[PDB]
């Protein structure tokens, strides 16, 4: 899912 | 740049070392507590030989890793308006008083009062354009003499609009309230009150606590928390 | 009694005689006579140098006789000798009393004196075999705070103190040789003549006295102020002097005549005057007001010919070199700026 | 003031010894320090300069990296440690009460100083005069010349003179050729401009005879002039 | 009864301060103008000077 | 709804930029490094201002999804923003420690607050921050998108297997845990010491005065918690369990990562003007 500042 | 000869290099080094010495010596007087001692003269101001000791007169003493400096300026004999601004970085301007001799009314002129003169001095020293943000402490008097005189003669009734009489606790409380209610700031200035005793530690621990409180309040104001 | 009443009446009669004698010779004013000459242009002075090193308020300074050296006295307890060329510090002299109010520089460049609020004036010798600045001898005998001190010669000094008396001391003997009395208010400033024979003073009673060095007696009294006087200085010619009070007025007096010639008043400023100085030709008047700024005046039509603003606190001391090259200002923020 | 120095004597090329200096009556910690190599009966040179508080250290080219100097501010003592020597290190050293501030002259108060015998900008050195007999009562003139214009923007000219007498440590006589030293007779004088400089004595008697040296003060390791003896 | 001496001293000083000569204002004004005009030629403040002879000029460093 | 997100990004950036530039201008002009707190406020203002320079690029990533700026630009801005994020918080911790040292201990440890240590302290904290962001600036790059477009995110290394649990736990346990405990303990001790000395000398007013300090402590801790809990909790929730990709969860995530930046404009308001600089401005 998301991991960090910008979700991917 | 390189135009300077061997003379100017040594001159610059001399100036740099003078600056170093001045900066080093300017940090030692920042942490020294500066007190101003003031009074009418017959207010126990001569009792420094034991209370605080184990033109301008200066005395130095240390208590609990602190340096204290009080300047007795009662003997200057000059117009106070023209030199009052010198004492500006001062904290805790002591005003030793003696109102136990008020009931035995001595005026030195036979038309004045001790209480009137004390209030005049308090207003003059607390209502100047300068001295804002400066705390005050009070040393009322030795409690023995007041008791001997209040009980024998009910002369306290001569005080303007006073109801009680022959009460040691109430008269002292009224005097303390009257002295404390003389400020006009009430938001940045306060008064610390102490009743003196024969023990020397009781008249020094109070000063230490008052100056510690003033320093804490000043640091809180500086750091922005207050 | 009757004797006191008649003496008071005689004093009033002599006062009226002085007043009408002064008024009889007032036929014109300086402005309407000097209006003929064209006004000087807008002067602009930039901060050439800025001097740093003091950690407290600065009260006085004195331009040296070499037009390049000066001293400074401040409340931190340090006396510092400056070099106006490279901004270097030549000497740093500690003081026994942390409170000082004035300083002076010897005409020969060997002696410096400073004292105040300690009832004592000390004389420092610069050129010594010991290499330091040690006090030569310590002068005592006053009962009030000293306000000013000036070196008449290498061995004679005249001082003013807080006991409303000015005494002409003798460095060699260490005792007073002449005492000037008569001031009802406290004396705050004095200035010396180029020939070192006559000197005036100003006091808090709005009065100025013309004293004599040799026989030690007053001849003339000047009035007109309505507030305390802080600074005073002669004219380079030697026949006039200017005064500075706390009521935002600077007035020009003269020695040969008993009238008022030239005064300053501006409605945009309500602050007093702390220092006054003259240039070489005396064309322009420098008056360092205490309103955080300094002002440069013109001595032709009482018209300000420029402003000099570089300080953010009270201005205390001024000074112009002997050759009139530069003018230096002082302030309580511990920053000395040299303007040219 | 009085200034006692030690360390004089004979020292072998391979060895170690330390010099001593004592400053009494004046602040040893606020005066620039200097050392002078007086070569007997000939021209001499300047040695080393350390400011008060050991701010800066300088060495002569011929002894660079070979000598050690250590200061003791509490004892007001400046030392000199040696490792190896050369025959051209015979010297007469002077701790001089002189620090570089306006109105003061370098090498002002030489004090006393001590000797050193070694057992076996920088204007060139030139002084043609060797010895000139003269009768008291007439002016005596000697000349010392440079190779570069010493008139800077400020106009300061760094020319110094000191006179040496037999059996006595020399002291300062004239500096700058415009300002006379103190504690010396007023009879000595001098005037010059441009490149050539001439020393002139107003009145001559028995006590105005000696050996003069002209010094230049440009590269702190500075070269000094030759000795010109005067015979009565 | 000690005020009589002080009053006499004050009266003496007041009557003795009136023994000097006086001149017209015009003479003093003319003298000041003449001095200013004569000595204005050597006034660095009045007449700005180029940096060649100015010893307090601002340099690069 | 991403357009409104971009306008929120832009207005937050403008507000923070104007506040920080006003603070930096006033301080640099006439604060003259007099008080020990002035240098700390200087670095806080510099750090937030440099922190909020990567905002438009992340906006152009969240909306207008494809990334035209390029590979080098992506890495450079994600390194700058990752360094400046960790640079600001430690300044807050240092300021809190300084305040505790100043108020609780007025006689001792008051001769070590001269305007010098702070410099050394500032250089050391910048150096300490530099090292922390090492992995970020040595593990990030370009990652393929299942949307069929381009973006600017962090690649998946093999240093700790999944590594998105280990990295998040380490970053949380440092950045959110240490400063919060430090500031809470320091402010609690400040309150306790103000209370203790109040009753020695019959403080005749301090009694009432010991409420503004409590209010300031509460406001500080509350805002620091509010601005940082949602981001970390949402990120750790995503790490712990996988969820189907839907626009709703990503839509709120943008606002969540917005408030973290939004706590940089309010930081000068609460830290700088609430001081003796009220006369200055
Ligand atoms: C205007 C601002 C936001 C631009 C940001 C760039 C930063 C790096 C700028 C802004 C202000 C500048 C500082 C202003 C004051 C000083 C004092 C000087 O003795 C050291 C450098 C230092 C600290 C400057 C370094 C560079 C600086 C910090
Ligand atoms: C990660 C870093 C290198 C990138 C950002 C560079 C700037 C913003 C950082 C790095 C080092 C920091 C400086 C280091 C220490 C000082 C001295 C202090 O008295 C003023 C602030 C100042 C000058 C800091 C300001 C901010 C600073 C200049």
Numbering used by the authors:
A (entry chain D): 1 to 8
B (entry chain A): 2 to 55, 183 to 354
C (entry chain B): 1 to 340
D (entry chain S): 2 to 121, 136 to 247
E (entry chain C): 6 to 66
F (entry chain E): 42 to 322
Question: Could you give the paper's own sentences about this structure?
Answer:
Somatostatin receptor 2 (SSTR2) is highly expressed in neuroendocrine tumors and represents as a therapeutic target. SSTR2 transmits extracellular signals into cells through Gαi/o coupling and β-arrestin recruitment pathways. cAMP inhibition causes decreased hormone secretion and cell proliferation, while the β-arrestin recruitment results in subsequent receptor internalization thus influence the cell membrane distribution level and desensitization of SSTR2, which may lead to drug resistance and poor clinical curative effect. The structures of SSTR2-Gi signaling complexes bind to octreotide or paltusotine are determined by cryo-electron microscopy (cryo-EM). The complex structures of octreotide-bound and paltusotine-bound SSTR2 coupled to the Gi1 heterotrimer were determined by cryo-EM with a resolution of 3.37 and 3.24 Å, respectively.
The first-generation drug octreotide is a biologically stable synthesized SST analog used for the treatment of acromegaly. Octreotide is a cyclic peptide that is bridged by a disulfide bond formed by cysteine at position 2 and position 7. (D)-Phe1 of octreotide forms hydrophobic interactions with I284 and P286 in ECL3 of SSTR2. The disulfide bond forms van der Waals forces with the side chain of F2947.35, while the main chain of Cys2 makes polar contacts with the side chains of N2766.55 and S2796.58. Phe3 forms hydrophobic interactions with I19545.52 and Y2055.35 in the extracellular end of TM5. Octreotide contains the same pharmacological core region ((D)-Tyr4 and Lys5) as that in SST14, the side chains of (D)-Tyr4 and Lys5 insert into the bottom of the orthosteric site of the receptor and are necessary for receptor activation. Furthermore, (D)-Tyr4 is accommodated in a hydrophobic pocket formed by residues F1273.37, F2085.38 and F2726.51, and Lys5 makes direct interactions with the side chains of D1223.32, Q1263.36, and Y3027.43 via a polar network. Alanine replacement of the residues F2085.38, F2726.51, Y3027.43, Q1263.36, and D1223.32 in SSTR2 significantly decreased the cAMP inhibition potency, suggesting that the interactions of (D)-Tyr4 and Lys5 from the core region with the receptor are essential for the biological activity of the hormone SST or octreotide. An extended region of octreotide interacts with the extracellular ends of TM6/7 and ECL3, whereas paltusotine is placed into a minor pocket in SSTR2. Collectively, we mapped the signaling bias–related residues in the structure and found that within the octreotide extended region, I284ECL3, K2917.32, N2766.55, and F2947.35 in the extended region of octreotide contributed to activation of the β-arrestin signal and the internalization of SSTR2 activated by octreotide.
